[PDB]
Amino acid sequence: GFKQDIATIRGDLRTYAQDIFLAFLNKYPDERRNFKNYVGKSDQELKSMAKFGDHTEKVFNLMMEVADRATDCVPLASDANTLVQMKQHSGLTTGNFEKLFVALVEYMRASGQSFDSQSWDRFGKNLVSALSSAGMK
Ligand code: HEM
Ligand SMILES: Oc1c(Cl)cc(Cl)cc1Cl
Numbered sequence: 001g002f003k004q005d006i007a008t009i010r011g012d013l014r015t016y017a018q019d020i021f022l023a024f025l026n027k028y029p030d031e032r033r034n035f036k037n038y039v040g041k042s043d044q045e046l047k048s049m050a051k052f053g054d055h056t057e058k059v060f061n062l063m064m065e066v067a068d069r070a071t072d073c074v075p076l077a078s079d080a081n082t083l084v085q086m087k088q089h090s091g092l093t094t095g096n097f098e099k100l101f102v103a104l105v106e107y108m109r110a111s112g113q114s115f116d117s118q119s120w121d122r123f124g125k126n127l128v129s130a131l132s133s134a135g136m137k
């Protein structure tokens with residue numbers, strides 16, 4: 001289920017984070033244009049840039065912290081606050097997050113594995129709603 005999925009992801013976090021972020025960028029090419037250093041790069045080119053590995057790992061670590069702290073796929077209000085607050089996220093609407101989760105759920109459904117895709121969909125929906133409550137437009 002959802003808690004096991006967190007362990008599955010954590011066990012090979014950089015690999016999952018990279019493949020899921022690539023799925024996002026590839027499904028939603030306009031979102032790539034917000035990452036200047038990743039424009040004009042193939043999947044294998046990104047996987048060799050240090051900030052790409054590092055940044056994906058740090059994003060997914062935080063995502064997994066938020067997932068682990070959630071109750072029944074509902075994140076903590078305080079976690080939503082952090083995500084709205086972060087300087088890094090001053091550009092963003094909740095649409096950006098919705099898209100990430102669509103890509104994540106699709107990746108999970110396509111993978112060989114017994115991810116609880118439905119729970120990740122609900123978690124994403126609940127995170128988006130918590131981001132609105134914490135003030136993201
Ligand atoms: C639950 C979802 C997400 C989490 C946990 C998360 C977390 C983070 C973290 C920890 C960083 C800092 C990375 C670093 O400095 O090494 C970051 C940076 C960033 N995030 Fe997110 N993020 C999420 C969703 C999104 C989405 C959907 C977008 C855009 C579509 C986005 C855009 C960015 C951008 C542009 C930065 C730039 C940091 C910089 O280099 O200045 N994030 N995010
Ligand atoms: O920074 C991101 C990562 Cl590492 C993965 C996904 Cl799915 C989306 C974003 Cl916006």
Ligand SMILES: Oc1c(Cl)cc(Cl)cc1Cl
Binds near residue numbers: 021053055056
């Ligand atoms: O370099 C980044 C990566 Cl690969 C993922 C995200 Cl979400 C943000 C940044 Cl700044």
